């Protein structure tokens, strides 16, 4: 008999709201926020130590018309000898609500958790950081993402301001991006040179490129071309798909929308770590 | 209006059977099987082109006591000009059944899909490969995994033998492993040297190491030590956790069970691509 997974996810609220779990993003994004807040280097990570299961059930699974769809708890222990340093809580917010309604629900939910985490006598009054995971819906190609964090100070109970997720973003091409991340800019330039094959004619590529902890996180590219049927557009999606694998960091989320005549005609997606990109047509 | 995700996952059968989705593994594992079967290099990947949604609903969501919990369809197009080369179908099998009951259900389900995929006139009679994703349950630390594949030949309908997933496995330490993967063996040796810090005394590490397409896939390690309380075991989990990050490939699943006195006392897990490992105690 081996110790059990102490962090379980509910699927009910996701069904009711047609929201993707996106577990990888929901877990990992929260780990990233932790490393922002302190030098996580040393700490040992444990899951779900202080919030009662019945309470999570209460707040997630027993609501007829839910907005909150999950709660995950990440507890970090560091040092005179290993004890608790901070708690991170990922609150999953449904695809149907706005970012503001997500924040509103966020405040409500967090007050209740602060209250409960403090009644647990094992808890050493460490800072608590709530982060909002804004979910995308089951028919959307985009992944859910973290949109705000708020923290409670050590030995306190009042929740801080909702704060932006540390993320620097860039436009491509831009002088700013080029000086900030030359070698990556060169990679995208190389990418663009691959699709040029679709008779040597240059094809302008536009992009938003965001970074978390200085490495490329997500790369959203757009191209606008003239529609010559599906056959042509297929050949182009293969040239582009391959070029994402050959030229772009595998640990980044890459998206390419192919537009024409005020329409998105195809989208290529290589998710955070995906062995191979997939194509969807309009 | 952007094209939609055409591959949606059901959560109902997973609820009923207390089974983890493990979406990353379920998708990516199937991509890996594809690359085994052909030089996927060129091909363009599209999702869910031939199986009707209503049929998936029928086979997954309408069964009172399900064994099959999802069906995903991956369609590969390659070349005189881009058309279909092969279909890959991942069948999700519940945590409660045995591998044999999974295969049994597998055969049943596949016959029905072969029948349906052939009625779709757009389908060019390409080979179809069914693979079984054997799910772990919601309270298990292990990830679901692919356990068998069976293929239907081009222009045919009869299902082939269930076949092992191409995966070479090794024991550590062993002479075999050392000659097959020296540099990786050195990495594990380095890992072991890190936990030696827990006063310079050697600690034997045992492992199973599996590979898919020649790179380390999963690394299951065991150590058996003497129990000196939780405080000591914590310090050791931090030394080990850090050592997984410092010394072991991030694109591998790493697990370390710490045993003592015929008991698994703690388990450290760094999932396929995890920013940081987590610890569970008995």
Automatic annotation (TrEMBL), chains A, B:
Top-level division of the source organism's lineage: Bacteria
Name of the protein described by the UniProt record: Sex pheromone staph-cAM373
Signal peptide: none
């Amino acid at each position: 008999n081996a110790p059990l997974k102490e962090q379980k996810v509910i699927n009910t609220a996701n069904i009711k709201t047609n929201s993707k779990l996106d577990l990888a993003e929901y877990e990992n994004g929260l780990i990233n926020i932790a490393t922002q807040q302190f030098d996580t280097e040393s700490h040992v990570l444990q899951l779900n130590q202080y919030i009662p299961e019945k309470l999570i059930d209460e707040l997630v699974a027993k609501v007829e018309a839910p907005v909150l769809t999950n709660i995950i708890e990440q507890d970090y222990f560091g040092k005179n000898e290993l004890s608790l340093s901070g708690v991170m809580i990922g609150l999953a917010m449904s695809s149907s609500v706005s970012n503001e309604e997500a924040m509103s629900k966020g405040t409500e939910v967090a007050k209740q958790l602060i209250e409960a985490i403090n009644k647990n006598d094992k808890y050493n009054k460490s800072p608590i950081t709530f982060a909002i995971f804004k979910q995308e819906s089951t028919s959307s190609l985009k992944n859910g993402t973290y949109i705000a964090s708020a923290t409670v100070q050590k030995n306190d109970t009042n929740l801080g301001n909702w704060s932006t997720i540390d993320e620097k973003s860039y436009s491509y091409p831009s002088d700013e991006f080029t000086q900030a991340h030359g070698e990556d800019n060169t990679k995208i330039n190389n990418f663009a040179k691959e699709i040029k094959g679709f008779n040597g004619d240059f094809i302008p590529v536009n992009a938003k490129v965001s970074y978390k902890k200085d490495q490329m996180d997500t790369l959203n590219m757009n191209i606008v071309i003239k529609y010559n049927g599906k056959t042509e557009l297929m050949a182009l999606t293969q040239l582009a798909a391959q070029g994402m694998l050959d030229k772009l960091p595998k640990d980044a989320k890459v998206q390419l929308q192919i537009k024409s005549e005020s329409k998105i005609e195809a989208v290529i997606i290589k998710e955070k770590n995906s062995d191979k990109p997939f194509v969807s047509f309009l």
